[PDB]
Design a protein around this ligand. Structure first.
Ligand SMILES: O=C(O)[C@@H](O)CS(=O)(=O)O
Ligand SMILES: O=C(O)[C@@H](O)CS(=O)(=O)O
Ligand SMILES: [Mg+2]
Ligand SMILES: [Mg+2]
Lengths: 236, 236
């Protein structure tokens, strides 16, 4: 029986809960929705980093084809090319390019999962496809919520639940931890997702930044069939 | 506005989330249900410790009036007087006595909350009274779930939700973290408590130990009006 666990934030990752597992990183509003979208639109790779300084250094390494995106406090970073809205990573803008990004939550969670056997990037947009990859990988799972500012966040949690549910649709040989069971419960009783996310503290932040469009987009189910994977510092 | 947070397990306590707050420790199956019951039945004090060796040493300090209780793996510890069933701490057995105890989860969570301004002991049995003490104390709150074996546990989580709900019944000037909001949600949609706890991994453990009686008892609401408090290594 495949085991499924959940970690509630980037500041609550412990190696022993991650190593040798299938880790699924979630930051649905908005980092993993961005990564998922960009790669689906023909982006060559995403390189997540922790600091702006390291991001500017990484540009020089990848040459003409590198672009700078992400955010601090949800805002575009001075001197970057793009922000952290999935809509701005259109095929025209990203095809074949190398996206250097650093974000408030998502990028920390990705780096924090290094010891896993496979690091998958998950979101509402590719939830079904992630569940399918989870089953294929046939290994125990930990769903790593980025949270927001090192705290449990309802958006990442319900999205975990959706994905767990999709895994369950594909098989019965499962054992959930109580954290996973609870996420799945929250999802199962709020399938539309949108409604319940409005209780997240982070939702007020998304609203005061005028990101209603990004919010509605990131709640769309199963529009991306791709499962990005972090490997040796790169996501393809 | 009073802030309410939640910590999901004894292994997830971070000082900065606890210091100077009102901390409410929960291990409803069964340590905090025991402490609550024992003190309500006229027990003089409870002294929680981390090891059996430290427990045997503490007996010598408190003399004739000391008794030994708690558990490992839910079982009575060799040479102890009582186990970790609330029913065995009757008034006849505990009145005026000093209860030295060590348990798998609850006692770790209590010690882990030392830096709080006030450490309260909470359970389903004294949930309402805890909420009343929380309001009186008029300080920000963290609800510290003991969990089981360092993991998020549905029993402690729903019990947190019940208590948060009771605080809400007594006031509107609140700000919940997403973790607290989620617990309250789980409770609010499962008010009877009993039903939903049966999904906890720990429930199977309680059942295979034949503790159906303890389980039904620990799910009883508002039968104890006392709020035990941990102060300088002692609970009164
Ligand atoms: O704090 C924020 O608003 C950011 O985390 C928003 S986002 O990660 O770009 O979605
Ligand atoms: O592992 C266990 O069964 C114990 O934690 C049970 S109890 O804490 O005595 O309720
Ligand atoms: Mg997030
Ligand atoms: Mg417990």
């Amino acid at each position: 029986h495949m085991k499924i666990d959940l970690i509630i934030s980037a500041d609550d990752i412990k190696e022993e809960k991650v190593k040798n597992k299938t880790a699924v990183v979630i930051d649905m509003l908005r980092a993993t929705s961005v990564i998922t979208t960009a790669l689906n639109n023909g982006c060559k790779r995403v390189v997540p980093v922790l600091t702006v300084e390291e991001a500017l250094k990484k540009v020089k390494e990848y040459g003409k084809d590198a672009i700078l995106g992400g955010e601090r406090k949800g805002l575009k970073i001075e001197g970057f090319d793009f922000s952290n809205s999935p809509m701005e990573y259109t095929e025209d803008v990203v095809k074949g390019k190398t996206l250097i990004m650093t974000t408030t939550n998502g990028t920390r969670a990705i780096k924090g999962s290094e010891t896993a056997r496979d690091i998958l990037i998950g979101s509402v947009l590719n939830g079904e496809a992630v569940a399918e990859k989870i089953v294929e990988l046939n290994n125990d799972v930990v769903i790593v919520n980025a949270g927001t500012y090192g705290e449990f966040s309802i958006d990442d949690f319900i999205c975990s639940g959706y994905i767990i549910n999709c895994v369950m649709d594909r098989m019965k040989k499962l054992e959930l931890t109580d954290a996973a069971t609870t996420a799945q419960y929250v999802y199962k009783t709020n399938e539309d997702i949108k409604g319940f996310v409005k209780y997240a503290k982070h939702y007020k932040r998304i609203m005061e930044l005028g990101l209603k469009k990004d919010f509605e987009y990131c709640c769309k189910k199963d529009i991306v069939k791709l499962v990005p994977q972090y490997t040796n510092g790169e996501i393809l």
